[PDB]
């Protein structure tokens, strides 16, 4: 076999590729305007989020059916193709297709299968393993942004980064597969009562799946609706652009770190209460920005918290889903669940911009984000796991 820490490395690789994909548009804003609108460019990012978040669902299903390796490597090919084709674009729709759909398609197919597979190697520590599958989305900015910046002084970014990302994803998918069906990597641990994981049709039909879905949409939407406004709130309060941006930049560090730390923490003490507390904290942050946000230090504290809570979602929801329905159907269960996040990624940033511009003030978007997080707090706290499924058909084998 292989040392079970390898899948952690693989998910790190794949998730880092996905982070580079989701971060690239920000480095591409100014070049594309110079040759030819920020909103026009941004529609490419929103299309990308939509396709990514939707394509996790087919990616999860196909991973569950025909294994995760084929899925991630196809995704690597699709992403490499789409990104690389963005270099040859000559119009806006060219970019919508190359980056928004092909690259988003490949990205979703890379993102999901490791998220499902890594915990299968770590039943003693499921949430930490998941965090390794999702931590790369924090890092992509750090490795790439400097490198992508180094290149333009822009098409070279698309082509060369597309190649490097394809290589990383193909390597990640090349070595990815669940443990052997029978023997689970361990060092430790009349007629019985045999339980079993949930089927995708059973999980999909469960009411708690959709409470979790709703909560996922709410939190995803809140964060995505206000994060882009953090620095503007600062500058609006009287800070220099340099100061405001410096402050908001701490968010990336917390968004990356929480993914591992929260995973480890709930592995140790359980999920529900920590998770609900994070949502509450996010709620309070949406409100508190109106008192802290006018100073580099205050604005930084809010950005760090917003980042901490936001990022935690992408470990804790898959971990929660794993607790409720088990790992055998996790490709399907969590892929369906992640589509909420695909939708929020599509609409949330736009809606936040619209509310601010509509009122000219930040009260509306931050208050709406606070309410969404409040509902999420409620759902996450109130929702306890369903009853473990009885496998009467294996139960009857005991004579």
- Tracing tokens 């990022």 back to the chain, one arrives at 311
Q: Tell me how far apart the alpha carbons of residues 205 and 201 are, in angstroms, rounded to a whole number.
A: 6
- Provide the terminal-to-terminal Cα distance of the chain, rounded to the nearest Å: 35
Binding ligand 1HN (rule: CB under 6 A), the pick from 53, 60, 76, 119 is 53
160 is known to lie in a ligand binding site: no
Least distance to ligand 1HN, CB of residue 310, Å:
7
Least distance to ligand 1HN, CB of residue 54, Å:
9
Q: CB-wise, 137 or 379, nearer to ligand 1HN?
A: 137
As for the chain, the residues directly before each break of C–N over 2.5 Å are 36, 153, 189
Binding ligand 1HN (rule: CB under 6 A), the pick from 28, 45, 52, 334 is 52
Least distance to ligand 1HN, CB of residue 49, Å:
4
Q: Tell me how far apart the alpha carbons of residues 117 and 45 are, in angstroms, rounded to a whole number.
A: 28
State yes or no: residue 49 binds ligand 1HN (CB under 6 A). yes
Least distance to ligand 1HN, CB of residue 142, Å:
14
Non-local CB neighbours of 360 within 8 Å, separated by 6+ positions: none
DSSP string across 126-147: HHHHHHHHHTHHHHHHHHHHHH
What ranges make up the beta strands (E) of 49-174? none
Q: Which of residues 277-316 bind ligand 1HN (CB under 6 A)?
A: 314
Q: Which of residues 311-350 bind ligand 1HN (CB under 6 A)?
A: 314, 341-342, 345
State yes or no: residue 134 binds ligand 1HN (CB under 6 A). yes
Q: Tell me how far apart the alpha carbons of residues 10 and 83 are, in angstroms, rounded to a whole number.
A: 21
Q: CB-wise, 198 or 317, nearer to ligand 1HN?
A: 317
Nearest residue to 362 (alpha-carbon basis) of 275, 302, 276: 302
Q: Tell me how far apart the alpha carbons of residues 338 and 383 are, in angstroms, rounded to a whole number.
A: 18
111 is known to lie in a ligand binding site: yes
State yes or no: residue 137 binds ligand 1HN (CB under 6 A). yes
Interface size with ligand 1HN, residues (CB under 6 A) = 9
> Cβ-closest residue to ligand 1HN?
345
| Residue ranges binding ligand 1HN (CB under 6 A) | 49, 52-53, 134, 137, 314, 341-342, 345
Q: Which residues are annotated as a binding site?
A: 111, 259
Q: Which residues are annotated as a binding site for (S)-lactate?
A: 111, 259
């Amino acid at each position: 076999t292989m040392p079970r820490w390898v899948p952690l490395l693989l998910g790190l690789l794949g998730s880092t590729t996905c982070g580079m994909l989701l971060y690239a548009w920000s480095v591409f804003i100014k070049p594309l305007n110079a040759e030819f609108s920020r909103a026009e460019i941004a529609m490419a990012f929103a299309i990308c989020c939509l396709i990514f978040g939707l394509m996790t669902f087919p990616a999860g299903r196909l991973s569950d059916k025909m294994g995760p390796r084929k899925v991630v490597m196809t995704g690597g090919v699709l992403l490499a193709i789409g990104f690389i084709l963005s270099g040859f674009i000559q119009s806006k729709y060219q970019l919508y297709i190359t980056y928004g759909v092909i690259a988003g398609f490949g990205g979703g197919m890379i993102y999901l299968p490791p998220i499902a597979t890594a915990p299968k190697w770590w039943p003693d520590r499921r949430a930490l393993a998941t965090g390794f599958a999702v931590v790369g989305l924090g890092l992509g900015s750090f490795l790439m942004g400097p490198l992508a910046t180094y290149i333009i002084e822009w098409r070279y970014v698309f082509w060369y980064c597309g190649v490097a990302m394809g290589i990383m994803a193909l390597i990640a998918g090349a070595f990815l597969e669940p443990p052997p069906a029978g023997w689970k990597p361990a060092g430790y641990t009349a007629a019985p009562k045999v339980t079993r994981d949930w089927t995708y049709e059973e999980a999909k039909g469960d009411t708690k799946f959709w409470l979790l879905y709703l909560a996922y949409f709410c939190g995803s939407f809140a964060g995505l609706m206000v994060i882009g406004h953090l620095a503007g709130f600062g500058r609006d309060a009287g800070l220099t652009a340099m100061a405001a941006a410096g402050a908001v930049s701490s968010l990336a560090f917390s968004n990356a770190a929480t993914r591992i730390l929260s995973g480890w923490f709930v592995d140790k003490i359980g999920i529900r209460v920590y998770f609900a507390a994070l949502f509450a904290l996010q709620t309070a942050a949406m409100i508190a920005i109106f008192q802290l946000g006018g100073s580099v230090v205050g604005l930084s504290i809010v950005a760090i918290v917003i980042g901490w809570n936001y990022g935690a979602m992408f470990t804790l929801f898959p971990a929660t889903c794993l607790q409720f329905y088990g790992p055998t159907a996790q490709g399907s269960n969590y892929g369906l669940l992640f589509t909420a996040c695909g939708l929020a990624g599509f609409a949330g940033p736009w809606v936040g911009g619209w509310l601010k511009d509509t009122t000219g003030t930040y009260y509306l978007p931050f208050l709406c984000a606070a309410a969404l997080c409040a509902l999420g707090t409620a759902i996450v706290f109130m929702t306890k796991p369903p009853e473990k499924k009885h496998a009467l058909e294996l139960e009857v084998l005991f004579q």
